[PDB]
Design a protein around this ligand. Structure first.
Ligand SMILES: Cc1cc(CCCOc2c(C)cc(-c3noc(C(F)(F)F)n3)cc2C)on1
Ligand SMILES: Cc1cc(CCCOc2c(C)cc(-c3noc(C(F)(F)F)n3)cc2C)on1
Ligand SMILES: N[C@@H](CCC(=O)N[C@@H](CS)C(=O)NCC(=O)O)C(=O)O
Lengths: 58, 264, 235, 235, 264, 85
C-alpha cells in the first residue's frame, strides 16, 4: 500500500539525443512498456484484494 | 519435529530458415509451454493419416489498415473444410491433434506498426445481449473467415429476432480481461522494423486425452495491432496478412457415418 | 538466511475457507401457501466472486474439498411462545436420485445418500470430499457446446444448447431441513457454507477478471472502465 | 541450594495475558440512523497502559503473539421477546484490503482474509501470530519522520508529517460482526481481547514511564509531580 | 520428565592519552554496550570515505553558568553541514555510521560542579501543546546549535500560529522519565575536582542494518548539570563547554541527485 | 590532485548527411591571446568551465587599451597555438 515510510523511488525517461528521420518517413511513432519480477522476489501475509466486489447474491 | 498420525482411511480426510512438413515447405519459433506435439501414450484402433492430414493449409488473406481492430479464429474449427482433415473430423467421434501456426505480413522499411499474435487455450468469448450464454453454434464457429474485434460494446436491442453473436472488445480481449496481460498466454510480436513473420507450435491441451472435434474447440488465435499502421505521410495504408496452419500428430477414433452440421 | 517463497505456493494460496452459499430455512406451522420448510441448493462456486476470481487464474484444476457449515437461528415474533433446541438435516442428492417434494417425504430416509445431522449450539459441521471429476481435471473454461445441430434435424431446437456448458446437472444438490416439528412460534435459520480446496494442482495460467462478473459465463454488461486517470509525466 | 532467577527472565516477565481492547457490537433491527451492527478496531498495544509500560522498558523487541477473545452478551429491554444463541465473526483486514461498509457486504466472504467464527457460550477463542515486522525488530521508539520538506515543494503541506510515526496504517484492523439476523429484542455484546507475547527478545533497556501517558507519543500534560514529601533525617 | 509433542507445523503455534583519527588528534573512555563500531557484515556498491569523513569536527562552544539547565543535540543531525560528511548524507538515500563523542570543560581547583553526559538511542522529546506529535521537522532538527532544557512545562497557548516546538523538562529528561534513572543509558560524569573531559564511543544502533540519515536520527546527546557551578564567593560564574564528534566506519548507498531540506 | 580521464564524443546523423569531425587530446594545451601584450590572458577567461570556448577563422586584435578583454583568440587552421592543423 501507499506509505512514505516504505517508498521505493522514481522512474523517469529523457531524450539523450533527438529522433532523426529522413524524408518520406513518418515523424511520429509509438513506444511500449513491460514490467516483470526477478528470481529474488518474495511476498508475505496473504490478504483479500480490492479489485473485485459484489452487491447481490444470485 | 512435530508428531502427526493420520486416522481416517481416506486420503481426502488427511490434513493438507525453412520448415518442411509433408508435401509443404515454408521459408525464432516459439513452442507453447515447452512441449512438442506427441501421440497418445501407452496408458479400438485409432486412425492416423501421417501425411494426408499433417501439412500446411493456407487460409484467406485479410487486410490491415489504419482502422482495423483485430481478428480471431478458432481451432480446429478453421480447418473443418481442408482436404482429408475435415473428412476425418466428420467421419469420427473422437479426435486429437496439435498445430503449427505461421503468420505472414510483409512491408517496407518506411512502414511502421506492430502486431501481437496470441494463442489461447479454451478461448471463450462474450455475447451481445442481456441473455447469458445465448450465442448460437453457427455464429460461434465462423470457420476460415473468422471474426473481428470492436472498440466498444454494442448491445443487440432486438427481442423480435436476436442475432446471438459475439461482441468482443479489443482492450478487454473479448473475455473481460485487460489486453496487457494477454502476454501470459503463448504469444509473438511482429514488428515491421525487425521481422515480417511469426511462428508458434501448439501441443494438444485439454482435460481429456481425446475429445470430439466438432462440439469443442481446443485453441483460439487472436491477432491485434498493438501499434497503428502508418506509411510516410499517406492518408490510407493497407497491407495483407496471411495465416498458414499445419496439423501435427493427429489421431482419430470412432468411425461411423458422416456428420453434417447445419451452418446456416 | 535468504527470503523464501513458502506462502506463495498454490496450496498456501488456496488454504483458506471461503463462503459460497447462504441458505434460509424456516420452522413453522405448515400451510397451503408457499413456505421455506426445506431448501435445495445447487452446488457451484460461482455464486460468490472471491473464490471464483482466485480459481479463474488457471484454466484447469484438480483438488479435493473441505466443507464447513455454520448455522445461526433467530425468532421472528414475540407473542407466540418459545422453542426447544432444533436439529438440522443436510442431505446430498447426486444427479438422478429422487428429490424431495415435502419436508417429511420418504426421500429423507437417506438409505444410500450421505447425510449430516447437526445439533444447534454445537461446533460447526465439517466434512471432506475427494476429487469426483469425470475427466482427468476440472475445466473452469469450456469453449464448446453439448449438442451439434444437424441438417437432417426436424427443427432447430433439437440441437440447441447453451454456450460454454457441459452438463445441465453437475455435482448434484444439497437439501436442508429442520427435523423437529413446528413450535407455536416461527423460527428462522441461516446456513452458511465455507469451502476450502486441498491438494491443489493447476494448469494453464490465465489473466484475472478485470470487470464485474455477469452470469456463469464470461459475459460483461456494465462498468467497463476500471482504470482511473493519471498524468503521463506525474509521479 | 541457592536462590535462582528463573522467574525474572524476559519470557517469564511477559508470560501473562493482558487486555488491549474492549469492543462493543449490537444486534438489532437496522435503521437509518447510526448503529453498531459491526465494529472495526485498529490494532495497537497503546490503548491500555500496563502492557505498554512493561514493553517500554526496552527500545527494540522481537516476539510472536497469542491472542484470546472473551465475549459477553446481555439484553437491553424486557418487553420485546427473547433471542437464540448468536454467532460472531471476527475478520482480520491487512493494509490495502477492502473494508466493510455494511454488516452484510461482500467483504465478509473472507476468501483470502483469515476469519474466526465463535459460538456464544463456548470456550474463549484463541489464535497465534508470528513475527510480522518489516524490519529486523519492532521499534517502540522512532525519532524521526516519514517525509522531509524540500525547498522546491510547492507548499508546506507536501512534506508535513507527524513526529515519531512510521506508517499511517500498521498491522491492519479487526472487523467484528454478529452473523445472525436481528431478533425483535436488541442484544448488546462486548468482546475483550487479551494479548500474550511469546519467544521474546529485547534490546536497549530504557527507564520506565513516571508520569501519565498522553497520546501515542511521549508527550506529557498533567500530573508532573509524582514523588511525595519526606524528611531528610527521618527514617 | 514431562512429555511434550508439538502438533502444529508452525513455530508460533508452539507453546512457550592521545586519540588520533584521520587528520585529527585530541590529547578513561567508555564504549557503549561494549560494542566497537564496525562495517556491515557479509550477510549496489556502498561508498565509504575512509578519511574524508572519519575525523573530528568541533561544534560551537556553549557557556555554563549558575542558571543553565542543560543542552541536547541529535546525531547525525548535528553534522549535516560538516565537510564531505554532509554532502555524502544528502547525495545518498541510505547511510550508516558510528560516532566518537568528546566533551571538554576546564576549570580551576577552586571551582566546583558536576556534569552528566548521556547518550540515548531513539531520543524522542515531548511537545509544547495539547496537540500530540505536532512538532515540525525544522524545530526537531536544530543542527549544530542544538537545544536547551527547562525547569517547567510552558504550554504554548496560541492557536492562531502554533510554534510547534519541543518543551523538555530537566527532571523529566524531556520524555516523561525521572532523570535519576538516565544512568541506564551510556553515560559519563565530569567532576571538576577529578577530571575535565569525557569520551564515549557509540556503535550504530537501529532495527535495520542501514537507514536514511535525513528523516531519522539514531542518537541523542544530553548534557545536564548535576551539581550547580560555583567559584569562591563570586555572584556570577561562566565557563565554556566544547563538543567534538568523529564519525567512524561510515557507509553510504543510493546515489542520486542532491537533497535540499527546507530549514526555515 | 591527480586523475586520468575517459572521453566519449557522441554525434548521430542519417545516411544522407555527410561530414567529418576531428577530436584531439593535447597535453599542456596553451592558447594565444588577443592583444599586443604577451601572456596577459586572465584566469577567468582561461577557465571557461563546462561551456568551453570556440575557434575563429581569423585573428581579431582587441584594439581597446581603456578596458582590455584579456581573452584567447584561437585560429582554426593554426590550432590556436601557431602550428598547422
Ligand atoms: C470445480 C468444482 C468442484 C465442485 C464441488 C465438488 C464437490 O461437490 C460435492 C459437495 C459440495 C458436497 C458433497 C457431499 N457429500 O456429502 C455431503 C453431505 F453429507 F454433507 F450431505 N455433501 C459431495 C460433492 C460431490 O464444484 N465445482
Ligand atoms: C509491536 C506490535 C505488535 C503488534 C501486533 C502484531 C500482530 O497483529 C496481528 C493481530 C493482532 C492479529 C492478526 C490476526 N490474524 O488472524 C486474525 C483473526 F483470524 F483472528 F482474524 N487476526 C494478525 C496480525 C498481524 O502490534 N504492535
Ligand atoms: N445486505 C443484503 C446482502 C446480503 C448478502 O448476502 N451479502 C453477500 C454479498 S452481496 C455476502 O456474502 N454477505 C456476507 C455474508 O453474509 O456472509 C441482504 O442482507 O440481503
Amino acid at each position: 500500500t501507499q506509505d512514505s515510510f516504505t517508498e521505493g523511488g522514481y522512474i523517469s525517461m529523457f531524450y539523450q539525443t533527438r529522433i532523426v528521420v529522413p524524408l518520406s518517413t513518418p515523424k511520429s511513432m509509438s513506444m511500449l512498456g513491460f514490467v516483470s519480477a526477478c528470481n529474488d522476489f518474495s511476498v508475505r501475509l496473504l490478504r483479500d484484494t480490492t479489485h473485485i466486489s459484489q452487491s447481490a447474491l444470485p | 519435529n512435530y508428531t502427526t498420525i493420520n486416522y481416517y482411511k481416506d486420503s481426502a480426510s488427511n490434513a493438507a530458415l525453412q520448415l518442411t512438413i509433408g508435401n509443404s515447405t515454408i521459408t525464432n519459433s516459439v513452442v507453447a509451454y515447452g512441449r512438442w506435439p506427441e501421440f497418445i501414450r501407452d496408458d479400438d484402433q485409432p486412425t492416423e493419416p501421417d501425411v494426408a492430414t499433417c501439412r500446411f493449409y493456407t487460409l484467406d488473406t485479410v487486410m490491415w489498415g489504419k482502422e482495423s481492430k483485430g481478428w480471431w479464429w478458432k481451432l480446429p474449427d478453421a480447418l473443418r473444410d481442408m482436404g482429408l482433415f475435415g473428412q476425418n473430423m466428420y467421419y469420427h467421434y473422437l479426435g486429437r491433434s496439435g498445430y503449427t501456426v505461421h503468420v505472414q505480413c510483409n512491408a517496407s522499411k518506411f512502414h511502421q506498426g506492430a502486431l501481437g499474435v496470441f494463442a489461447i487455450p479454451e478461448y471463450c468469448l462474450a455475447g451481445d445481449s442481456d441473455k447469458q450464454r445465448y450465442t448460437s453454434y453457427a455464429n460461434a464457429n465462423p470457420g476460415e473467415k473468422g471474426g473481428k474485434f470492436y472498440s466498444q460494446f454494442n448491445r443487440d436491442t432486438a427481442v423480435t429476432s436476436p442475432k446471438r453473436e459475439f461482441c468482443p472488445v479489443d482492450y478487454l480481449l473479448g473475455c473481460g480481461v485487460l489486453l496487457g496481460n494477454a502476454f501470459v498466454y503463448p504469444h509473438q510480436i511482429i514488428n515491421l522494423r525487425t521481422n515480417n513473420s511469426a511462428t508458434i507450435v501448439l501441443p494438444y491441451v485439454n482435460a481429456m486425452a481425446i475429445d470430439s472435434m466438432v462440439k469443442h474447440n481446443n485453441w483460439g488465435i487472436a491477432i491485434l495491432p498493438l501499434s497503428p499502421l502508418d506509411f510516410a505521410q499517406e492518408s490510407s495504408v493497407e497491407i495483407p496478412i496471411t495465416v498458414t496452419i499445419a496439423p501435427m500428430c493427429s489421431e482419430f477414433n470412432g468411425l461411423r457415418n458422416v456428420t453434417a452440421p447445419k451452418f446456416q | 538466511q535468504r527470503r523464501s517463497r513458502s506462502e506463495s505456493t498454490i496450496e498456501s494460496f488456496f488454504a483458506r475457507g471461503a463462503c459460497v452459499a447462504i441458505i434460509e430455512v424456516d420452522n413453522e406451522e405448515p400451510t397451503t401457501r408457499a413456505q421455506k420448510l426445506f431448501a435445495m441448493w445447487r452446488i457451484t462456486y460461482k455464486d460468490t466472486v472471491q473464490l471464483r476470481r482466485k480459481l479463474e487464474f488457471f484454466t484447469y484444476s484438480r483438488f479435493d474439498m473441505e466443507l464447513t457449515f455454520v448455522v445461526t437461528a433467530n425468532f421472528t415474533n414475540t407473542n407466540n411462545g418459545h422453542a426447544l433446541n432444533q436439529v438440522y438435516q443436510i442431505m446430498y442428492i447426486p444427479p438422478g436420485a429422487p428429490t424431495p417434494k415435502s419436508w417429511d417425504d420418504y426421500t429423507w430416509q437417506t438409505s444410500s445418500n450421505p447425510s449430516i445431522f447437526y445439533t444447534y449450539g454445537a461446533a460447526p459441521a465439517r466434512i471432506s470430499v475427494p476429487y469426483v471429476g469425470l475427466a482427468n481435471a476440472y475445466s473452469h473454461f469450456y469453449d464448446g457446446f453439448a449438442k451439434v445441430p444437424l441438417k437432417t434435424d426436424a427443427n432447430d431446437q433439437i440441437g440447441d444448447s447453451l454456450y460454454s456448458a457441459m452438463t445441465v446437472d453437475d455435482f448434484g444438490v444439497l437439501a436442508i431441513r429442520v427435523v423437529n416439528d413446528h413450535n407455536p412460534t416461527k423460527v428462522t435459520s441461516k446456513v452458511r457454507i465455507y469451502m476450502k480446496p486441498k491438494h491443489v494442482r493447476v494448469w494453464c495460467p490465465r489473466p484475472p477478471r478485470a470487470v464485474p462478473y455477469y452470469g456463469p459465463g464470461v459475459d460483461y454488461k456494465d462498468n467497463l472502465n476500471p482504470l482511473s486517470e493519471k498524468g503521463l509525466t506525474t509521479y
